[PDB]
């Protein structure tokens, strides 16, 4: 049972090069890497936005059910066909998640969709190693992962431009393109209608085929990627060496389920079981650490900016004021101090105002677009509101007697910093595709590990303004190189027989490990900044650990 | 104390109209002239609209297209323009008149009226 189909594979394959076909299924497969990148954000970071000016995170959990199910597969029924599928229930029902009215239809279709996409990336890579010599596995499949950020800023750019505001959590009707929100979704799902569009040109993996029996097949696919190849340099026409290498769907069912438990099982077994844990300790606490921090860093910039608004904020001793009408508006924190005998304010817009220890008898309100303004130990005495904005909600405890209320009335941030991390990734990348093959996978994954650890403590040096986006840019660059080197790790580790099952399910881990790291860090945020900068430390260490005793890039 | 005037009740069909027209008298001063409101079976009385101050108005979203509030201040009086009367939408409608003398604000509602609808 000796592994000659391999070698044999990879002699064709380096005798064919790299050509022109590599590029273009480069292109094609970066379409749907995108497609994850504007998912993840538009889950993670606007799904979340929808307050009322987090139960956003079932669709991670979806997210995993896909990964493990598209994975698992895509061995059987090949890598193509598995991708297109999530890409098309992905496409499908964000076009359907853009139309619904409500929250919670909202919530299941964004779930379903999350289901493909988080399918996607296994079957992207596992797609593309199987295409290159196995000389360069790490220069392009790291070039490969660029689409990811060029996806988050496709994400931040179309959010910050077209719904720069929030909170429609409660917002919705039976219209359409009347919030924005529904204007968001359709374009933030466009690049996966072009990873599907674009997928049909391309040929299914000669390595799926050889496994599977079909041989002709993958001779045929090689054989147009040689043809391809020779052609795109025009005067080359090189030959090629041409050589061998009802009940009746519920059993069917049962025999493809079990056919993907004994895939699984066989990641674990006297072999690829100590790799498999291993990787699982790596790829749970990179996932962990990243994804929190990624959430952490701007809800402590939003943090950050209240304590400095909270220190902004003045107020003076007030007087008795007859007919004050004071018919500007204000900004200032509080008024302490009131007696307004005969008050008559009209048309006052307060935003962050209070009154404390404050009177009024005969008091008269015309229009007030109250906001974040409440009123404490305020005596009312005989006071006619009118029009405004003022309920229980806005009102804190205080005496009230003979008061009446006739009439009564119904991001561009986040974004900015979320696409300043994701534009700071990109010298990673650039620095990490051509090292990677020339340093060596292990240990360019070793040293971005350790770099990410150090730089977890520089994380809460700059509790300034600046130094917090430079420290998440920083961040971002630094971790980079361990995912693209672990990528390249996992798919040269795991052969074609169970390697789009073992990536999808450390995949899997890695969804879980994100729930759990967004739900930890958001938790305790603005905490003595110290959870966040131990937590991460310590994962980030552990990860370290375990990235130096994993088997070469031959195993 | 200002004496009231409340109108206008009785059977009308959709797509037909109702005037109900708020009217006051005595102890008039610069006064919010009457506002509409809505009665329900349940303790309760819906805002409808008003157009009592100046020439701007506030109409409840749940009336949008359904009630519209015209005043003449020189004769005291707001015109309830009732339109679009889908008929599940009956109630008892009340003005509410707001004092803005030199006593302080002072309020006044009148007995109301019961508005149905033909079909």
């Known amino acids: 049972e000796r592994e000659e189909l391999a070698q044999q594979y990879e002699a064709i394959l380096r005798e064919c090069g790299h050509g022109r076909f590599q590029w273009t299924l480069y292109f094609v497969l970066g379409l749907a890497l995108m497609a994850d990148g504007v998912e993840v954000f538009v889950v993670g970071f606007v799904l979340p936005s929808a307050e009322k000016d987090m139960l956003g995170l079932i669709v991670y959990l979806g997210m995993m059910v896909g990964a493990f199910l598209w994975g698992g597969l895509a061995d059987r029924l090949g890598r193509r066909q598995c991708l297109l599928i999530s890409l098309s229930v992905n496409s499908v029902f964000a076009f359907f998640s853009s139309f619904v009215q409500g929250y919670g239809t909202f919530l299941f279709c964004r779930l379903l969709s999350g289901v493909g996409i988080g399918g996607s990336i296994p079957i992207v890579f596992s797609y593309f190693s199987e295409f290159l010599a196995q000389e360069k596995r790490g220069e392009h499949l790291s070039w490969l992962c660029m689409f990811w950020m060029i996806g988050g800023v496709y994400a931040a750019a179309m959010a910050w431009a077209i719904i720069p505001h929030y909170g429609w959590s409660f917002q919705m009707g039976s219209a359409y393109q009347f919030h924005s929100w529904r204007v968001f979704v359709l374009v933030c799902a466009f690049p996966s209608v072009f990873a599907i569009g674009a997928l049909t040109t391309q040929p299914e993996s000669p390595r799926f085929f050889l496994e599977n029996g079909k041989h002709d097949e993958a001779w045929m696919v090689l054989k147009q990627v040689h043809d391809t190849n020779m052609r795109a340099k025009g005067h080359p026409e090189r030959v090629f060496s041409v050589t061998h290498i009802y009940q009746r769907w519920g059993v069917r069912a049962l025999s493809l389920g079990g056919q993907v438990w004994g895939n699984f099982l066989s990641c674990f077994g006297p072999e690829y079981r100590r790799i498999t844990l291993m990787m699982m300790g790596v790829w749970f606490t990179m996932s962990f650490s990243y994804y929190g921090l990624t959430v952490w860093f701007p809800d402590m910039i939003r943090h950050l900016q209240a304590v400095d608004y909270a220190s902004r904020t003045k107020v003076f001793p007030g007087e008795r004021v007859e007919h004050v009408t004071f018919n500007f508006t204000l900004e200032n924190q509080i008024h302490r101090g009131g007696q307004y005998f005969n008050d008559k304010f009209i048309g006052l817009r307060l935003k962050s105002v209070s009154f404390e220890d404050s009177l009024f008898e005969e008091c008269y309100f015309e229009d007030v677009t109250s906001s974040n303004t409440f009123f404490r130990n305020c005596t009312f005495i005989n006071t006619v509101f009118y029009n405004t904005d003022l309920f229980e909600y806005k009102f804190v405890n205080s005496r009230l007697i003979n008061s009446t209320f006739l009439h009564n009335k119904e991001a561009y941030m986040v974004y900015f910093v979320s696409f300043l991390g994701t534009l700071a990734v990109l010298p990673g990348n650039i620095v990490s595709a051509l090292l990677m093959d020339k340093i060596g996978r292990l240990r360019m994954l070793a040293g971005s590990s350790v770099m990410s650890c150090v730089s977890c403590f520089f994380l809460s040096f700059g509790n300034s303004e600046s130094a917090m986006i430079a420290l998440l840019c920083l961040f971002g660059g630094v971790s980079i190189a361990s995912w693209n080197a672990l990528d390249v790790l996992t798919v040269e580790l795991y052969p074609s027989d169970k390697r789009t099952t073992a990536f999808g399910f450390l995949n899997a881990l890695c969804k879980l490990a994100a729930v759990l790291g967004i739900s930890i860090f958001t938790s305790f945020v603005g905490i003595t900044k110290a959870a966040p900068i131990l937590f991460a430390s310590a994962a980030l260490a552990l990860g370290s650990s375990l990235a130096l005793k994993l088997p070469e890039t031959r195993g | 104390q200002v004496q009231l005037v409340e109108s206008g009740g009785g059977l009308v069909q959709p797509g037909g109209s109702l005037r109900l027209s708020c009217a006051a008298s005595?102890?008039?001063?610069?006064?919010?002239?009457m506002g509409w409101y809505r009665q329900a079976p349940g303790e309760q009385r819906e805002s409808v609209a008003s157009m009592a101050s100046g020439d701007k108005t506030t109409y409840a979203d749940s009336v949008k297209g359904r009630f519209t509030i015209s005043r003449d201040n020189a004769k005291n009086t707001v015109a309830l323009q009732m339109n679009s009367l889908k008929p599940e939408d009956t109630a008892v409608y009340y003005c509410?008149?707001?004092?803005?003398?030199?006593?302080?604000?002072?309020?006044?509602w009148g007995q109301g009226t019961q508005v149905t609808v033909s079909s």
């Open positions: 509410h008149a707001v004092d803005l003398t030199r006593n302080g604000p002072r309020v006044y």
């Open positions: 005595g102890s008039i001063f610069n006064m919010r002239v």
